[PDB]
């Protein structure tokens, strides 16, 4: 797997119905009708949590929609019950996504009587399953690329929303996984992979080298920023650092490779060789250091063929001087990706079980 995805967080089963039923029975003490409707909704919601977060999930759209629907539904009932006045006896227990190390500290599992905590962990699971569905996709198929682009940008924006909102209505320190720095880095990683998908779509369609170079160069920035962040404080699984380092260098090489083709077409034979030499040294670093995590053989050969043929033609025919890298026009950047904002509802055919209350 060259693409990073995130494991879903684990949670204990909760009787979500019991305290909502009790509140309904106290609000509508004579209302046979209202008790029957909203208590049924409360039992439906408790089944929905069990379906969304209480079991392992297949990497299918139907499982993500269940998750998305659960997130919408708990956002919808927040005002309709006194969660705010701490008068609903509900504790949610969640386990850090990143199950590594000794166990030491005491925060593998964290229990909080907080709907805000529940919201953050559920949205984390939405992001995580989105990252997994995206990473399952066949990127040699056009619909796989479309799904991957949508799901990476969703995951990016869901992880960002958690970063902007998690500390508020959490009281004490979160588990590390949902901490603002952890989800911030995850957000960037997903955006980088989203931009990589657009670069692979452009490659698959044999679009002009100029845009491909620019798509790859934007991906380099994203992977470079993710990698810088994940160096500082590394909390993530051990494969993330070397994959981001690899993809940072690979995407700079792709940018230089495709720019080199445009330099050739424009008869700038010296720049072609200058850029192909940069591509090659970047791919030498990757092969050398990130051998375990990415396979760059076919790319490395392509570069070396193009470089050999360029230098023969230039030495015999063109005699173009090979520019220093510093004197090259910077490659542009084409941004095709954004962190998709979280605006409830994010599920498909969303009906609030407590619409009527």
């Amino acid at each position: 797997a060259t693409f990073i995805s995130v494991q879903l967080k684990k949670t204990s089963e909760v009787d979500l119905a019991k305290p909502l039923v009790k509140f309904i029975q106290q609000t509508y003490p004579s209302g046979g009708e209202e008790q029957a409707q909203y208590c049924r909704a409360a039992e439906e919601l408790s089944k929905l949590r069990r379906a969304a977060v209480g079991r392992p999930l297949d990497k299918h759209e139907g499982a993500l929609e269940t998750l998305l629907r659960y997130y919408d539904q708990i956002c919808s009932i927040e005002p309709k019950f006194p969660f705010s006045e701490n008068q609903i006896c509900l504790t949610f227990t969640w386990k850090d996504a990143f199950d590594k190390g000794s166990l030491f500290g005491g925060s593998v599992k964290l229990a909080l009587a907080s709907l805000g905590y529940e919201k953050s962990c559920v949205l984390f699971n939405c992001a995580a399953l989105a990252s997994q569905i995206a990473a399952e996709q066949n990127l040699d198929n056009d619909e796989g690329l479309k799904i991957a682009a949508k799901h990476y940008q969703f995951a990016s924006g869901a992880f960002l929303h958690i970063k902007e909102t998690v500390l508020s209505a959490l009281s004490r320190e979160p588990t590390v996984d949902i901490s603002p720095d952890t989800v911030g880095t995850l957000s960037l990683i997903m955006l980088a992979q989203a931009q990589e998908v657009f670069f692979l779509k452009a490659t698959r369609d044999k679009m002009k080298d100029a845009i491909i170079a620019k798509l790859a160069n934007q991906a380099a920035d994203y992977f470079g920023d993710a990698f810088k962040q994940c160096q500082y404080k590394d909390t993530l699984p051990k494969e993330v650092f070397p994959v981001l380092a690899a993809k940072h260098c690979i995407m700079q090489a792709n940018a230089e490779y495709h720019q080199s083709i445009l330099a050739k077409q424009q008869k700038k034979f010296g720049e072609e060789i200058a850029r192909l030499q940069h591509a090659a040294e970047l791919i030498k670093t990757v092969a050398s250091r990130y051998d375990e995590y990415v396979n760059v053989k076919d790319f490395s050969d392509k570069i070396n063929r193009a470089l050999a043929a360029a230098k023969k033609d230039n030495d015999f025919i063109y005699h173009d001087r090979v520019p220093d890298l510093k004197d090259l026009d910077p490659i542009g950047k084409a941004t095709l990706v954004k962190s998709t904002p979280v605006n409830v509802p994010i599920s498909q055919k969303f009906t609030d079980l407590f619409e009527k209350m």
Partner: protein
């Protein structure tokens, strides 16, 4: 003696049809329209042959530049308000909104 903004409009439009600026725009537009949730409009654009699609997207971008800049001279200050006035009316025209957003980005570079 053309208004300053009218000249810059015609200069930008020229680059869309004859220049590399245009080639990038129609490749950016095809990738955004490719990526978005399918509408009959988006499906139709995608089914077109490259040459036909390139031309349609240039012509649509022209229409939106001419719409966004169609001002007196005072609207060329606070151009972001033109985005605010127009964008909300395109929520049910997702192709047109995508093209309008790129036209606004192009237009902003010159007028700011």
């Amino acid at each position: 003696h053309h208004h300053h903004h009218h000249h810059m409009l015609e200069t930008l439009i020229n680059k869309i049809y004859t220049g590399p600026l245009g080639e990038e725009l129609v490749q950016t537009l095809y990738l955004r329209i490719w990526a978005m949730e399918e509408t009959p409009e988006s499906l139709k654009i995608l089914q077109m042959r490259e040459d036909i699609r390139d031309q349609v997207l240039k012509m649509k971008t022209e229409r939106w530049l001419r719409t966004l800049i169609r001002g007196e001279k005072t609207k060329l200050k606070d151009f972001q308000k033109r985005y605010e006035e127009v964008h909300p009316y395109l929520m049910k025209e997702k192709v047109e909104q995508v093209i309008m957003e790129e036209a606004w980005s192009l237009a902003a570079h010159i007028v700011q």
